[model samples]
Target: EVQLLESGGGLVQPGGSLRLSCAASGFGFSSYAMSWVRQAPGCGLEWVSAISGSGGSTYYADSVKGRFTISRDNSKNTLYLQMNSLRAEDTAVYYCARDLIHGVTRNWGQGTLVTVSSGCPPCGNFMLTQPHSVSESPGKTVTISCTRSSGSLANYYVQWYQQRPGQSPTIVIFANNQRPSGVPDRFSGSIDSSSNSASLTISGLKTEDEADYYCQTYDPYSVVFGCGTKLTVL
Candidate 1:
C-alpha cells in the first residue's frame, strides 16, 4: 500500500518558520505529482501548493504564494514544504497528498499539526456539523448530511472526503457533486438550500465503502470542516 509519512510539525512562535517533510513509499515519488493542503482548527481545507512529478511545474494558492516553497528530493523519496513568517491564523494541520488525474488525490500523509502559538487560539465554533455515524447494508443507499452552522450552504461549493482506518483522507466529491476521475458514480453530493446543508449520498454501497466522511467548505477568509461522520457497512 502507498504511504506518506509526514514530520516536522509542532508549536511555532509568531514570525517563526518551519519546514515539513513527507517521505513517500510504495510508489515512485518522482513519477507522480503531489500536493500540499492545510486545514485550520475546526475549519475547512485549503490547497496550499502542488508540484508536478518531474519537478517541472508548480502551483500555489493565493494565500501562500510568497511565503511557502515546495520542493522534493527524488533520491530520498521525500517532499518538503518550507513556510515562513508564520502567524496565528497559519496554525493548521498540513497534509501532503498524491495527486491523480482529473484533480483527484489518492494517498495522503497522516498530517502534521503546525501550531503558531500566542497560544494558537481556537477558531471558534465549527462552521459545519454532521451526524456522529451512519450505517447501512450492502446494496443499500445512505445519505450523510452536513449542515452549516451559520451561513447559507449554497453560498460556496462543498467538498467531501473519505478516510479509512489508519489511512489518510481522500477527496470523494469535490466542487459540490463533481466526481473525480476515479470516483464511482454511486457517490454523489448535493446542497439543500431549505436546510442550509450539503449532502453526500452513496448508492449500491459495498463493505469497502465503510469509512469516515467529512464535509468541507470556505468563506471569504476562512475554511471550515464538518465534524466527520463514520459510516458502517454490514
Candidate 2:
C-alpha cells in the first residue's frame, strides 16, 4: 500500500515560479518512480514530467521541457516539481502518481491546484482538444472528436477511456480505434487519418454513456490525455 499527498499550492503570478510537493508513504521511497500530470478546469489531462526515485533519471513531455523541473528528495520520501515562467493557461490541478509495473498509474496524490493569474497562455503545444461537455438523447447517435494541437491526427493514434464518478478510468478503445474485447458494439471508435483527428461514436446511446470521456495518446516520449468531455443523457 502506498499514498502520495501533494501540497504547496496557491497562486503563482504570471512570469513567476511555483514549487509543489508530494510526500510518499507505505512503500519503499526509492523503489518506484513518480510522474506528474496536469488537468485544466473542464478539460483533459497532460503529462508534464516524471522522476525516477532510485536513479534520479528524469523525463518530461516535450511541450513542458524547459519550463518544468522534476526532482526527488530520497531521504524525506518526497518528490518535487519546480515550474517557472507560469502563464494564465498554466493554471491547472497537478497530481503526482507512483509508477507501477507496466506504466499503469496507481496511488495518485490529492492534487495541488496551481493558478497563474496573468500573462500569455502557456501553450501545451501538442495537447489534444475535446468538447467540454455534450448532451444527447438516449436513443440518439453521437460522435466525439479529439484533435491534437500539432502533427497530423492521422499520424498519431488515440485511446479512449470512460471515467464514471467514484471509479477508476477504464480503457474502451486503444490505438488505431481497437476496441477492447467484449466491449459493446454500439460503442466504436475510428480515426480519420486525413483529418488528423480521432472519433468515438455511440449509437443508440444509453444512460450509462453519461460519463466523462478522455482521449489519450503517446508522444515520442510521454503519455498525454485530452481534457475530458462530459457526456450527458438528455
Candidate 3:
C-alpha cells in the first residue's frame, strides 16, 4: 500500500533534521502535489506548506521560512518532506497530505510526532496546557471549546496555526475573536455556532490566509481536534 511514513516520531534534539515521508499506494506520487501540516500534541491545526511532487521546491507563508524541503520520487511512488535546524517549536505531529480537485484529504498518512528534545513548540510534561480562548470586538464575536475524545483539558486554547514547512506554526488570528498583530480584523470565530459545533470564520478573506485550518480546544487536560478545514482560493 502507498503511504506517508515519517522518519523520526518520538523526540528530537534542537538543530537536528526531521525526515518524513508520504508514499502513494496505487497512484504515482509524481502525478500529484503534496503538502505538509502540523498539529501541536494537543493544541491546534497548522498549515506548513505545499510543493509539487516533480520538484523539491516549496512555498511559505511569511517571515517564518527556512530549512525545509518537500520532494517526491515518482519512480518509487514516495514523497519526502525534510526540515533542518529543528527548534523546540517544531515539535508536533507532522502530516503529509495530497491535493485532489473537488476532493479533500481522501488520503492521509499517520502523522509522526517529533517532540523537540530542545525547545520547539514549547514543551510540557504532558501534551496540552489550558482551555478556552474567547474574543469580542466592535462588530464580531468569537469562542472556542477545546475538548478531546478523552481526558480533562486544563490549559490548552482552541486556536489555529499557519506556517511554512519545517518552521514553527505562526500564531495567526488566535483565540477566536482576537486577531494577532499583522492579522486582519474581519476574522471571526465562535464557540457554538451551531447546535453541536464550534466554528471560525474570516470575512474579506485574503490569499495570504488561504491554508489548512483546524478546530481545537481544551477538555480539561484533553486537547481535542476537528479533522481539518482546508481553504482553496477561487
On lDDT, the leading prediction is: 1
Rate residue 102 of model 2 by lDDT: 18
Candidate with better lDDT, 1 vs 3:
1
Model 1 CA lDDT for position 170 = 83
lDDT of model 3 at position 201: 66
Summarize candidate 2's per-residue lDDT along 1-234 as a digit string, tens digits.
567888988986888988999999999978887888876765556678877657446778766788988999989998999998887877878887776421335456668889988422232247777787888999999999887777666655677878776444556777647777767888889987776778899999999889888887655456667777899998
TM-score of 2: 0.63
Count of backbone clashes for each model? 5, 6, 28
Backbone clashes (count) for model 2: 6
**Residue 12 in candidate 1, Cα distance off native in Å:** 0.9
Best candidate according to TM-score:
2
Q: TM-score per candidate, in order?
A: 0.62, 0.63, 0.49
Q: Candidate 1's residue-wise lDDT over 82-156, tens digit each?
A: 999887878888997886531345567789899998732322133688888899999999999998887676767
Give model 1's clash tally: 5
- Candidate 1 to truth, TM: 0.62
